[PDB]
Design a protein around this ligand. Structure first.
Ligand code: HEM
Ligand code: HEM
Ligand code: CA
Ligand code: CA
Ligand code: CA
Ligand code: CA
Ligand code: CA
Lengths: 678, 678
């Protein structure tokens, strides 16, 4: 409904050309029944011309993603810190569109690659469109926008053969990281669980840069944007992400679509850290440096409002593929800072839409339109939709009585640059020495992870680095890792055949910061939408009965239940042949199906050992697993799963099973199942 | 070579702009060292503009693919059957470029999706570029080019949410196949192992359409192109293909690249079936219908020459992404037929290149250039790279002395339409009744597969169709399947909880045809490039010695050997953490590593049970597997793998192990390991 005016219905009627002439489109016009096709067949050509031109260039980065519509609602009148109109009253609602994404892969690459992720939000405000073009990691790899193509060429596939897809699994990416140590912070983030989130709904959004909030009186404060998930933070484990990439490349986009269709649209509290202009260098780093966070211990979050996504697109291409974000889409009340990464973005996003749209009128696409009137003297250009009535589109004029009028701080609610901003000094292509500590914050982030989480990050490093051919590059990588943590360097080095360099303690410290760990962020606040696979059998009507019973108990609490069996029928959603543990957040075997549970289990209907392997994989990957009905030994012993294990459940009673199992879903992952380096 | 002149060497020198001005590109120009970026920074803007515009539209279909250069060599002077110059002398060599692809997936989609595959070959002939734009399956889904957008919309992701990336795993695709029964032949091919080829090198190429060979005397014959692999035919198994999609999305592009680098460039015999014009309707179907094969029993293959691919591109984007094939790239000695699918293709490929290139001068890209002089009156257009001297580009002229001269059948070796061709009848948008048997050949194909191959095809259909939500679509699928084979329909129906319709014997028959089965095609003629994984341990110096002695022997037979252990070091190529059975065509455990091979082991260096799961997966997927080093069947017992099994090896002596295992690699798959229906 927000784009309802542009909708085209085809639920009735006869086929027409694009100019409304009724036509057919199923057989070519030929010179005889077995003859050649005629050039005069305009039906053919118009249809095939359209087909032939359907594709547009993918985004230069973040090509793989998915989007949805929603609403933002303000918690207060924030005129005490910003003139921004969308934040000017308690309860004030503004429509939004959000696109989530990975970064490196092309538009058909898997959701569950290890990567940084995008979180781009458009507020269609009553004073113009405002975009916050963020990521799920609060810091960036580089400190100057001019370096963006260097970073992106290095992580994207090698350009002789376009291998590999899979940003971290090759020499060039680690060459760049080891030569450009600014990269360490974001690298450590991407090697954590934040690189493989469980869903777009279980990750946060960050503006990354310091921005300014500007009041109507001209005064300014420095801010960081934080969109804090109300679904909780959660990750995949790496092996699971790898399997999912193959079994369901669409996993994150489907998770989002489904959550919305079920009335479980995801929410975030939109927050800021707010600090004075005089605290630009007060926190031990420079707020212009996008490789640093402000620890929450120095600057707490202020909740500004609620973001909720609750309506899927009607046409993906028209809405999600064509949405064209820009940090240049700014509104009165907000300003830029002199972060050199942000500064250059402002150029990039206006220019790149020429590439994608093929012409200058991209703001006229329905998804890009504002929801207020446009008054300016921009004209013409390919694809111009507007029929402008003002035949004197110049300023200054008298022949249009001086309209449109100039808007500025003092009239017309113009945008204005924060008037306290200044520049001083030589015109330079020099990096500020205040940017030079590339290692302290990576150590702060590492120190804030739990032991098992540190292990997972080491293990991701071990996995990726071991795929680098060049022994020199590997050596250079350990030089940098060792500046963050000697222990990381040692542990990584052990997997890859090299010695770590001697400890260099210049940047070592034991400080920690809250709110960055996933494993430490406690049980999820809600288990609605989480997936429970019930493994049953058609060979015992009792097993189906148990499955049906469990289904109703689980569905009542908003879990999404899949009953698996050998073949489909009423009440069974999925065959063993298609099922996989990656499909579930928890796995329950009904004891009527215990006979299936052997690695022995053979059938033309599924691969040998499949039922058991679903259970075993679930267990190995940390998930809650159990057996419902009272008889658990045969299944559990076949799986080599201990009955007294944490997150392993066995009960006859369905109610008591479900009560226990739902606590395990909230815990989400049983990290005691993963080995630690000693 | 038009490509050698445009190669750019950046191995030395200072950075310049695109107009040769030396510059830097690492720091933006700023007003002071913590200041805003300046608009006058041309270094910044030229770099970022280029980045911002790097991407071009992907191909409308066959977006995912990979290419190589090579040579075609004629085996004879074929002037007795065609005027074509590249085929006019024994030993005549012509440069080629080939791109292979899937069909439905975008860029970045995995190579090992179930799909039809492209095999497009450019012959840079001495009489112009000649393209054969083929597929690895000899028949196409539809019988008229006007239906292409219908087919492609139906198999591409649902356009509200762009889900799913798997072409056959959704309702719309099956809706289309069940409403458009022409699709049955290609559908059966795609559900066979030809949907998941082991590599590009292990599949054939087909022109699909009937074409004409035209002699210099104007006479013509009807032909089908067959490019027959000299590597042998081979497939993946489905579960393996799904895992590979996640573990290595680049699997086929890497396989090809690596084969060429190692001097094992792939080969095909370029063959034709040749039949007289009078046989258009002699074989029980119409040669204008691209849903039908001519059985080899009725028309044998004649070998024309050798295709070999032996040089990789220098820059993927410039060469592989930018190659623009067209069936309109035809040469004297070849002509079209009135196949309504081919007829419309001729329009599409010229038009769609305007989309991809953004302008009309795409034939000037080096990869698209010919190898002979161009003489015509085409002029101007965006991106015009030539400086034409002739200032009277019109015919007829006297001001340029009547040049260029018209070329035709008599003068100048012109292309000419086969002079025997005629048309007669009304101008109609009607399908020929001779196209109406949509079911007999699908059954011929199915009858030709071996029993376990028929099971694989049933199982693929069971898998995909079980993912269709609509019970009606499922019913309608069964209706069509049942017209090809009641048994297929019964066996598919059993997996999806419907009953099959009663037998309809109109199109049933028991005929078979040679050369279409993969499982039946016998051992591979070469094992060069095949991958052997040797699972070892760093714990035991015996294990590493055993792996080295095995390696050195296998490597001499052209096998690619990977030694896997817990960590890298001398002699060890890959860690258990990154290893997968999908990485290998055969797996060996050295008996010194026996202690790793339990469902436990446990280590922070790899996931629990990973060593044994590599071996177990390899066995379940049909691969030759064994233990080298004697007396130990502790490994075979932990894996539940029977020592007496075909393709299971156990030998103390490295030489007897290598002799046996090398036979197993040629056999390739041990299909006794897969269960059949009852
Ligand atoms: C803080 C750093 C950055 C963040 C958080 C970020 C975020 C993102 C996001 C989320 C998208 C996808 C938006 C959508 O979903 O359509 C994107 C696209 C893109 N970004 Fe960035 N970005 C960063 C830095 C850079 C820099 C430094 C440049 C260039 C100098 C750049 C150039 C682009 C380009 C060209 C696109 C494609 C835009 C399109 O086609 O509409 N970004 N960015
Ligand atoms: C016998 C049936 C067909 C075969 C074997 C076939 C084969 C292929 C191949 C191999 C490619 C990829 C070439 C490359 O690697 O760049 C391709 C691309 C394409 N085909 Fe077809 N095709 C068939 C039918 C059709 C039909 C009926 C149409 C349209 C009416 C069509 C339109 C296209 C388009 C638009 C492209 C993209 C070409 C480009 O951007 O360069 N094809 N085809
Ligand atoms: Ca590389
Ligand atoms: Ca984690
Ligand atoms: Ca254009
Ligand atoms: Ca669908
Ligand atoms: Ca002619």
């Amino acid at each position: 409904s927000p784009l309802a005016a542009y909708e085209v219905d085809d639920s009735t009627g006869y086929l027409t050309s694009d100019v409304g002439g009724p036509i057919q489109d199923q057989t070519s016009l030929k010179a005889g029944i077995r003859g050649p096709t005629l050039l005069e067949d305009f039906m053919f050509r118009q249809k095939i011309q359209h087909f032939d031109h359907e594709r547009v260039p993918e985004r230069a980065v973040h090509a793989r993603g998915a989007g949805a519509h929603g609403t933002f609602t303000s918690y207060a009148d924030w005129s005490n810190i910003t003139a921004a109109s969308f934040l000017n009253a308690t309860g004030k609602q503004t429509p939004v569109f959000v696109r989530f994404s990975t970064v490196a892969g092309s538009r058909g690459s898997a959701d569950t690659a290890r990567d940084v992720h995008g979180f781009a939000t458009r507020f269609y405000t009553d004073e113009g469109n405002f975009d916050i073009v963020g990521n799920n990691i609060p810091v960036f790899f580089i400190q100057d926008a001019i370096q963006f193509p260097d970073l992106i060429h290095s992580v994207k596939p090698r350009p002789d053969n376009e291998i590999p897809q899979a940003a971290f699994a090759h020499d060039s990416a680690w060459d760049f990281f080891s030569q450009q140590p600014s990269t360490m912070h974001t690298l450590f983030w991407a090697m954590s669980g934040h690189g493989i989130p469980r869903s777009y709904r279980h990750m946060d959004g960050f503006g990354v840069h310091t921005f300014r909030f500007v009041k109507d009186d001209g005064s300014s404060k420095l801010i960081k944007w934080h969109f804090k998930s109300r679904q909780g933070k959660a990750s995949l484990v790496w092996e699971e992400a790898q399997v999912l990439s193959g079994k369901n490349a669409d996993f994150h986009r489907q998770d989002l679509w489904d959550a919305i269709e079920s009335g479980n649209g995801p929410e975030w509290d939109v927050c800021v850290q707010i600090v004075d202009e005089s605290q630009a260098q007060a926190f031990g780093f420079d707020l212009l440096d996008p490789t640093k966070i402000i620890p929450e211990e120095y600057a707490p979050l202020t909740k500004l409002g609620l973001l909720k996504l609750d309506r899927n697109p009607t046409n993906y291409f028209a809405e999600t593929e064509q949405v064209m974000f820009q940090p240049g889409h700014i509104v009165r009340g907000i300003d830029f800072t002199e972060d050199p990464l942000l500064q250059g973005r402002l150029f990039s996003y206006l220019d790149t839409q020429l590439n994608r749209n093929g012409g200058p009128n991209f703001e006229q696409l329905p998804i890009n339109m504002p929801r207020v009137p446009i008054h300016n003297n921009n004209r013409d250009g390919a694809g111009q939709m507007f029929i402008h009535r003002n035949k004197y589109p110049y300023t200054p004029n008298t022949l249009n009585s001086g309209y449109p009028r100039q808007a500025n701080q003092n009239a017309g609610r113009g945008f204005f640059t924060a008037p306290g901003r200044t520049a001083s000094g030589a015109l330079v292509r020099e990096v500020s020495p205040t940017f030079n500590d590339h290692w302290s914050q990576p150590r702060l982030f590492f120190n804030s992870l739990t032991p098992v989480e540190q292990q997972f990050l080491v293990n991701a490093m071990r996995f990726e680095i071991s795929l680098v051919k060049s022994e020199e590059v590997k050596k250079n990588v350990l030089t940098q890792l060792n500046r963050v943590s000697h222990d990381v360097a040692v542990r990584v080095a052990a997997a890859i055949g090299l010695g770590a360099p001697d400890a260099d303690d210049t940047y070592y410290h034991n400080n920690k910061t809250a709110g960055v760990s996933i494993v430490g962020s406690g049980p999820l606040p809600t288990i609605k939408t989480l997936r429970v696979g019930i493994l049953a059998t058609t060979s015992e009507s009792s097993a189906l009965d148990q499955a049906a019973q469990l289904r109703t108990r689980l569905e009542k609490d908003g879990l999404v239940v899949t009953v698996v069996a050998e073949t489909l029928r009423e009440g069974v959603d999925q065959t063993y042949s298609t099922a996989d543990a990656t499909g579930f957040d928890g796995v329950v075997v009904v004891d009527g199906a215990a006979a299936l549970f052997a690695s022995t289990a053979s059938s033309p209907l599924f691969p040998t050992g499949r039922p058991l392997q679903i259970f075993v994989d679930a267990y190995r990957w940390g998930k809650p697993v159990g057996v419902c009905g009272g008889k658990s030994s045969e299944v559990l012993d076949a799986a080599d799963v201990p009955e007294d294990g944490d997150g392993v459940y066995s009960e006859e009673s369905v109610d008591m099973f479900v009560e226990e199992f739902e606590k395990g879903l909230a815990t989400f992952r049983f990290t005691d199942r993963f080995a630690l380096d000693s």
